[PDB]
Amino acid sequence: NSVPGAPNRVSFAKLREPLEVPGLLDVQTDSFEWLIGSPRWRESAAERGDVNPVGGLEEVLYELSPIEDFSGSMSLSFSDPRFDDVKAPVDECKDKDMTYAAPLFVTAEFINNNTGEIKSQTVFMGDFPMMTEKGTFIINGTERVVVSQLVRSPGVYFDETIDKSTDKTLHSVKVIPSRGAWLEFDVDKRDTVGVRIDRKRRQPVTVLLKALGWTSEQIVERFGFSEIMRSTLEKDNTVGTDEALLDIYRKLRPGEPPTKESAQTLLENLFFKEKRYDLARVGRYKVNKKLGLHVGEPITSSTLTEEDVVATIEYLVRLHEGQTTMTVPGGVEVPVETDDIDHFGNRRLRTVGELIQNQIRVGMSRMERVVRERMTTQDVEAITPQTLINIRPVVAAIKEFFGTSQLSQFMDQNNPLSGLTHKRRLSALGPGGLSRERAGLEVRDVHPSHYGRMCPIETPEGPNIGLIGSLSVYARVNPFGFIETPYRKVVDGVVSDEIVYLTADEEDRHVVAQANSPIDADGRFVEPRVLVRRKAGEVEYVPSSEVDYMDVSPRQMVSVATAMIPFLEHDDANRALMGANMQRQAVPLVRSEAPLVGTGMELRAAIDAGDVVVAEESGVIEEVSADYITVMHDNGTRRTYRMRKFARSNHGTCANQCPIVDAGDRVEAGQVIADGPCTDDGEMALGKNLLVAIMPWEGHNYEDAIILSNRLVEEDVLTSIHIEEHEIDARDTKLGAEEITRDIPNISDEVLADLDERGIVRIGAEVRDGDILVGKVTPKGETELTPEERLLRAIFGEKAREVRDTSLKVPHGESGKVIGIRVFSREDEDELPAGVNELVRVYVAQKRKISDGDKLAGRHGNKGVIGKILPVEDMPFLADGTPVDIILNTHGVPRRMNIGQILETHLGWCAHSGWKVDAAKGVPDWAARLPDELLEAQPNAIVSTPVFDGAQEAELQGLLSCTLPNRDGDVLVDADGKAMLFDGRSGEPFPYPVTVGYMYIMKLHHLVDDKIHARSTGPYSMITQQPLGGKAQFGGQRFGEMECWAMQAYGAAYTLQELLTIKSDDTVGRVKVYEAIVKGENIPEPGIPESFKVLLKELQSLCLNVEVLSS
Amino acid sequence: RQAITRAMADQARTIRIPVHMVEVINKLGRIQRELLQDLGREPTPEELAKEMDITPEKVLEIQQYAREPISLDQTIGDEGDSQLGDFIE
Amino acid sequence: GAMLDVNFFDELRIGLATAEDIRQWSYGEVKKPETINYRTLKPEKDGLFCEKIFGPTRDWECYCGKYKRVRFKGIICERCGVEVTRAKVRRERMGHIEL
Amino acid sequence: TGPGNRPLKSLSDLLKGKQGRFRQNLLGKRVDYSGRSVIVVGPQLKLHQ
Amino acid sequence: RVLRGSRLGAVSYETDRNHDLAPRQIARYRTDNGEEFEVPFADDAEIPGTWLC
Amino acid sequence: KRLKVVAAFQQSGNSPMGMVLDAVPVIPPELRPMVQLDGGRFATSDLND
Ligand SMILES: [Zn+2]
Fold first, then answer.
1. CB nearest to C34's CB, from B16, B21, B65
2. End-to-end distance of chain D based on CA atoms, in angstroms?
3. In whole angstroms, what is the distance from residue A67 CA to residue A106 CA?
4. Is residue A61 within 8 Å of residue A81, measured between CB atoms?
5. N or C: where does chain E have the smaller number of CB atoms within 10 Å of the terminal CB?
6. Which residue of C10, C30, C96 to mutate against A (max A Cβ within 10 Å)?
7. Where are the transmembrane segments (chain E)?
8. Pick from A1003, A986, A973: which is nearest to A875 by CA?
9. Where are the alpha helices (DSSP H) in A946-1064?
């Protein structure tokens, strides 16, 4: 809808939503241009207040400038962060493996206080990466995506854990800053206070307030109303400020002589000097909103204050006292309440701007340390900020973050849905945040503040459940790093159209009705009793006047990829989770046919996917190709769009981009002009539409096993192109240099036919497993010859041929054509790593068919390997002679609670057949809420069910009733949804009608050749003598602990001895066993394993005389 | 300072390098860092050979001699269960 | 008591080791903190890879290269000072440090 | 520690802890003459097959 | 992805001929503190007086 | 609690003289090898330091 290139997909939308889906990569692009200070951001943030817009770099420079010597006698300042242009275009970076970046120019300024100058240089600060228009970064040719990270916001957090031995609520507080120091004000097991600072284990309030510098009377006039504070004030044991300061200095610095003056200043430095204690602007806003301190003035002074400290202690003693609200002097009253660590008012989202900002801040910390260093050691009135500034720790920090980090991951792109899914991804693990195993169970769960913000469905089901979710569709990030959420505000019962971006805390202030609320087409609710959500997640039937907010649409809770599942509301969350998680794992077919049944998301998600060439400017087509489209703009200019054909993705999948328009066509702005990998005519296409039946057939579809037709092999319906890139380098050595040539000693000439004059194969040569790709030989030198070899070389007239051949051989089970050769050379002035002379890479590609064992799945979690590819005749076929394509199992359906596949099957047969209901007596009563231009349908017409506003039981069944025949008068499927099948094997009809129809299924990237793995004798280890493991090698199989338990439990002791000794570590045993097999003899006795002897030598090395005795 | 620089030449590298080669490595690194600041990019070995008046293959041999060894007691996997030495054919 | 471990095991007695037994175990005293040359990539004398002490790295080839045959076995060349043997005794042989 | 404040593996560290010699020997050994694949149903086959 | 290395030592493969060897001498070396060491030298080898035992 | 370890030294043929140490053994070097990689990048075993 309202996209000029959208194909006419018809909907079942009963409710007309006002808000459209936003620009789904805003979470990347707006954060990055916030960090830049783009003029786009500059106007855009100013469009919502924000009188002083500051970029992230501007913020770091302003919080760093000025730099000062310890004397105060000279100073350094920064100004004007400006960018250059980029140093290379995108495709050239991605080919030549250069990172896509742009330099930084910063106007520094040094000032001598003693005489007075400015030193305004323009410092080249260094290269700096740039987010592409797909929202990604390209690093060293690889394409990476930074993941957004959740942490708890800095502020004041409140709780109590009642001691069951004491039956007393133990109210506690963690005043956590950003980049600061801990301080906690507990209530002890006794009737005292827990004022422990940075884990110094024991403190009362009196030591802190006299350490602050209060008298006992100044403690009295604020704290007047608790025997708690009075008991602690009589447990003071130190009266006087300096005694408290030296006690603090004693307990803080032990192993240090005391001084009374520095004790007051270090405390003033540790909490109030804002160069070693910086809770952020967000932290200041959180605290000041929490206690009502700065209710009328904006945010500055990012350190603490004693006012805030005494307000913290007073709130603590009242919350341990039991109150409802309290005003601090000068402050608006806040409700006395504790805190959650899981509500989204307390858990902010460090986006990519925050992450790069923190990395640049910690790099500038070391750079500033260098500046403080050479401020004194260098001479005066001769230095310059060129001499002062070293940019190496900053650029090293940036390069360390974009590499080798938890958050910087590869762009997981086997299909553009997984691209859009690895983008917009939320993580709770990483640096700063909690780790995996240290984190408990409660943060894995779903608080009701997740609603509309973080999708409660989509998450990995491995050992990461709850830790990694994604955004909702309509979610958007607060400039304070929170998650705001749109709402249609409703006034006086009348629903308005003022869309209000609400966040989590102001959600709890109010009370919100739902999308399935009956409107009288004038805003007003007709129910007097309406569903509504209370602040603690409670649901009531509100009297229909107090509601101030309504949802913008349905499906506001759900993610993008989960909102591509029809009939979601009928599936249980487990199999829906499995289906949505597998839906990012589809592979691109060579056809990419669109589904008959879908949501309204497949167009918008594919135009936001990046891998669809969109017509930028409205115009007319000039000339097309298979590689480019020259567009003719309506005023003058012309523009080509270079298609990416057969590009290798990050997991071997293909990236073809075919054009979809003709030469005389007229296009508009924002229109799809070239489909991508998994797209058709603009919208998403993750698989094919197949005629399916639900019978259990012959035990081949036993327990989620799937059978197929041979027609899927015959017509290449499920066929993906896999592209694998191999690599070998020419390298320097002591004995000479590595040489890439046809001279490859000991070998036939017939196996050297496909390669060129210098060793590399030519384009299009079909390879098998274990052939030669890059003919390359290394110098070896001279050793002694064995006399038998000397005799044989004497007989045959052969030389020694001293060089040793390590050519690039293609590994096991990989074959196909050879598309492209990219070759780099040190002599040809290419950049190479050290000691490397010629780097050549070979693009190997093959076209895998479908095969028994491949992992297939529908969009509902119904997954499974392929049981048996049956031929085309032995198949339960329909009465017209159409065979079914795949056959699922019945028994896996009811126990998995996922009947959305059945509803999809019925709807798919309805959409394939095409219908036209009767209107002779007008609208039949079931089709009343069914909207118009749906009473008819052409066969093979695309339809769409929205997620929570879809076809009802009445609509689906009544539409299934009227399902007009195909070629002859052939009502193939009854009103029940079943049909009479004929056995292709026996020939008799089945005695019962069988559910049939069309289900849209997928092919997944868990293929057989990517998992098949075997080894008789391959590479071993180096340290231990164990066989090396991994599919990159030949690899072995870990005969683990419970395996040893099981073979002890049989008592098969000899085979256990076999597996533990002469297949793992009996170094002298392996060769004799191989020899005895080849001779056909008895397998010899298993010797002593290597791992025992290593233990024996280590225990002898650890000064322990280990003795071994027989008698 | 002489004895301490003697110690830093002798006992600070696991593979022992004589003191003159250590000093020309330190000179090479100091020149490399200084031309990183002044040139603005990492220098070419031909430029460094021009700077320290030696041959570029001598520069490459010094770069080969300057590489410190690595340990086998870190985990290549971000999930730490396998030592780095568990992948050496 | 059998260190060559030929398959009749009955007991495994752990015991504290005397310094007399420690110097009884070793085949030499390492006394230089060297590992290997940077340049020729051969191990150094009196180092932590000393072929005079720990053993040959090349199967039946001494360090000085005077003897290179398996027929030359169980002898020690007077120049290199190395017992010519199979090059897996470096798995077994221990050294010691007199403090 | 060594580079970047990672503590050095001592001689006793070979025997204790996660990567200890006893437990890693007790954990398992990868073996020769083995293999793996994904499995499919074999409904026509005999039980001892 | 695959990475390999090399312990710098030659691995030769002959048979452990126990019977046919080069014949050899045995020289008794004595240290300072009354310790005897007997070092297997070759027949065709000059026997050095000084030795690191 | 003292008589435990005292009778432990008494009953066996041990001696508490070995509790202090004079000569330190050295583990065989192949257990702690310095293997090169492709290009002279050496891989020590962290005991050598
Ligand atoms: Zn020798």
1. B16
2. 56
3. 15
4. yes
5. N
6. C10
7. none
8. A986
9. 953-961, 1041-1050, 1053-1061
